[PDB]
Amino acid sequence: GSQILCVGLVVLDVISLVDKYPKEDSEIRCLSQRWQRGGNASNSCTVLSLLGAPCAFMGSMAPGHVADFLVADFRRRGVDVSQVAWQSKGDTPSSCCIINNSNGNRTIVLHDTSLPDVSATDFEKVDLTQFKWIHIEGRNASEQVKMLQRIDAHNTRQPPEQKIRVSVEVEKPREELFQLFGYGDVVFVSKDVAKHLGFQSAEEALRGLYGRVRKGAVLVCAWAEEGADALGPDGKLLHSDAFPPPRVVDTLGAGDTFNASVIFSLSQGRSVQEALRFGCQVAGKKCGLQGFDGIV
Amino acid sequence: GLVPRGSQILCVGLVVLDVISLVDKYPKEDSEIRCLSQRWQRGGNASNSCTVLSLLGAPCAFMGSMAPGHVADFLVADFRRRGVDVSQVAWQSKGDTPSSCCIINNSNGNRTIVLHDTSLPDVSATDFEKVDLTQFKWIHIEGRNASEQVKMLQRIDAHNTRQPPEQKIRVSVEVEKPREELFQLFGYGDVVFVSKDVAKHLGFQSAEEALRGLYGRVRKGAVLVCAWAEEGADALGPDGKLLHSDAFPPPRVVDTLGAGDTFNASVIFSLSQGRSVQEALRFGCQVAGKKCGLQGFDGIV
Numbered sequence: 001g002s003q004i005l006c007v008g009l010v011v012l013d014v015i016s017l018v019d020k021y022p023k024e025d026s027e028i029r030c031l032s033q034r035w036q037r038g039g040n041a042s043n044s045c046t047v048l049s050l051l052g053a054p055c056a057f058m059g060s061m062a063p064g065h066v067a068d069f070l071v072a073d074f075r076r077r078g079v080d081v082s083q084v085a086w087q088s089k090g091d092t093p094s095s096c097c098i099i100n101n102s103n104g105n106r107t108i109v110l111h112d113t114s115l116p117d118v119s120a121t122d123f124e125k126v127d128l129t130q131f132k133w134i135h136i137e138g139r140n141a142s143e144q145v146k147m148l149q150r151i152d153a154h155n156t157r158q159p160p161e162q163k164i165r166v167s168v169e170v171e172k173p174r175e176e177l178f179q180l181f182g183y184g185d186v187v188f189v190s191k192d193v194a195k196h197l198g199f200q201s202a203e204e205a206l207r208g209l210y211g212r213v214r215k216g217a218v219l220v221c222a223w224a225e226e227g228a229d230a231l232g233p234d235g236k237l238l239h240s241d242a243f244p245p246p247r248v249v250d251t252l253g254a255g256d257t258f259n260a261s262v263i264f265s266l267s268q269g270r271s272v273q274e275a276l277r278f279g280c281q282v283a284g285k286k287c288g289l290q291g292f293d294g295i296v
Numbered sequence: 297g298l299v300p301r302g303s304q305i306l307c308v309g310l311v312v313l314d315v316i317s318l319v320d321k322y323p324k325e326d327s328e329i330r331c332l333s334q335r336w337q338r339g340g341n342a343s344n345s346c347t348v349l350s351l352l353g354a355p356c357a358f359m360g361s362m363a364p365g366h367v368a369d370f371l372v373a374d375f376r377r378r379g380v381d382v383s384q385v386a387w388q389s390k391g392d393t394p395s396s397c398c399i400i401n402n403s404n405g406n407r408t409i410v411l412h413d414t415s416l417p418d419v420s421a422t423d424f425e426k427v428d429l430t431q432f433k434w435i436h437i438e439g440r441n442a443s444e445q446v447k448m449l450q451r452i453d454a455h456n457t458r459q460p461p462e463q464k465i466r467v468s469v470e471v472e473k474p475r476e477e478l479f480q481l482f483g484y485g486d487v488v489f490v491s492k493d494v495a496k497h498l499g500f501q502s503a504e505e506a507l508r509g510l511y512g513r514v515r516k517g518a519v520l521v522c523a524w525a526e527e528g529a530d531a532l533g534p535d536g537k538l539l540h541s542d543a544f545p546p547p548r549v550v551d552t553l554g555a556g557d558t559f560n561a562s563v564i565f566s567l568s569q570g571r572s573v574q575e576a577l578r579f580g581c582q583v584a585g586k587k588c589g590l591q592g593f594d595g596i597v
């Protein structure tokens with residue numbers, strides 16, 4: 001019971017670093033380029049690993065030269081990949097990512113291949129006893145709500161001493177996913193989802209959405225340079241200022257760095273206030289670097 | 297493997313990986329969107345000409361810079377997919393194998409391009425010194441780093457100096473970007489290709505204006521060639537006679553990307569087969585026009 005598990009996408013991020021965002025129908029030359037392992041649950045595994053937390057990724061992956069790269073990266077980072085749902089149909093997805101080196105803005109064109117999502121069945125097939133935490137990136141909702149019911153069940157039959165804690169990310173403003181607010185002890189909702197839904201602050205959002213969460217759970221909302229807020233059952237709003245770097249050069253996967261770091265801190269039994277601060281602290285540190293090398 | 301003496305046509309230039317995404321609307325900065333479709337394509341002038349020469353039935357080799365890595369691995373597998381010999385590649389210990397990102401707006405046609413970075417060092421004159429030339433019957437050079445490429449051309453001139461004219465290596469040059477450095481390249485090669493774009497920048501309004509206006513810059517006996525899209529192509533040799541062929545536009549135009557490279561390679565092929573400039577011009581125009589109605593190079597046959 002010593003590992004954290006993330007369940008979501010792994011994506012090849014084909015990255016271009018430019019010094020200003022290109023105007024439509026124009027042509028500019030990038031400063032530098034790199035390939036990076038990406039996808040939300042993949043990114044959080046990078047971060048959890050860098051923090052010293054044994055973790056494991058679980059997502060789909062079609063065999064090929066791309067996947068061979070993604071996997072060589074998972075190892076080397078020490079991410080247990082042994083839970084991957086290897087596909088036959090489809091290619092592994094990839095993104096074009098334009099990173100604006102003057103403000104770290106990152107723009108992403110995702111080629112979501114037909115590759116099929118990890119399912120209730122893939123999941124029903126995993127040894128829950130290895131994990132202290134399970135984080136799920138909201139993608140195939142209805143099919144994941146099932147993986148969530150399974151974990152609750154396993155919990156029921158377990159001494160509070162050894163229940164598996166669960167967190168859930170709703171990053172995309174998409175209906176299918178809104179049912180997912182109802183699971184997990186921790187629920188991450190993005191600024192985009194919040195805005196796409198009426199609210200224009202992290203505190204508004206938390207008041208609004210708290211009704212939708214499972215009894216006793218914490219709802220977390222980061223808001224970039226506004227920092228991040230949390231709201232638990234006690235009804236007290238928690239806040240943390242951001243730790244922006246002097247020069248913000250790369251925000252690609254800052255949100256995932258925040259999620260990972262919050263998860264990490266909580267899994268070490270720190271308070272919600274402490275973990276809020278940790279998340280901003282580490283996400284902010286990453287925004288001042290290209291990639292993840294160097295956040296520790 | 298063993299390459300027979302004087303059998304291959306060599307093309308020296310750029311190879312680049314083009315990632316091409318088609319989208320609903322141009323992405324607003326800091327957004328996360330889905331393309332309609334995405335394609336990884338081997339690109340570059342000397343690179344495309346190599347593809348075309350293989351499809352035409354010529355043994356061809358590519359010389360360009362690459363750095364070891366997954367991008368290079370993809371480009372090399374694609375080269376090989378098109379029957380192109382890649383053993384002359386100049387492998388580099390520093391820099392990125394070129395890769396470009398292109399975003400095609402589906403609701404209006406616009407292409408927005410992020411060009412490859414400048415990290416990888418071009419093929420040098422000393423890189424090229426190491427090449428045994430006897431395998432080649434023709435050598436074509438995409439103009440890039442002209443001061444260095446001039447030395448390569450001087451080397452071939454030296455080589456040729458000492459051969460029966462039946463084993464002299466024919467040489468062609470392409471000046472396609474309108475930048476001053478390249479213009480000294482006009483002075484080299486038996487066949488000089490100048491692009492419509494370059495000609496326009498020098499202030500010429502037609503293939504005829506450009507050939508007459510620039511022929512001064514070529515070496516005694518050279519042929520200067522200019523293609524002008526749907527106005528066809530002209531050539532102008534040492535005898536002063538402006539040759540011309542009309543375009544062979546396709547039923548409907550589908551993909552013009554790399555049609556100039558298809559023209560260059562077709563002309564080169566034709567000439568290398570001992571056809572006359574007028575026949576080369578015409579052939580070049582046919583294959584290029586066909587390619588324009590085709591997605592990629594598959595059916596140019």
Ligand SMILES: Oc1ccnc2ccsc12
Pocket residue numbers: 222223224225227228242243244251254255258279280283284287
């Ligand atoms: O806390 C954050 C979460 C996501 N993005 C950013 C960017 C600067 S701080 C920060």
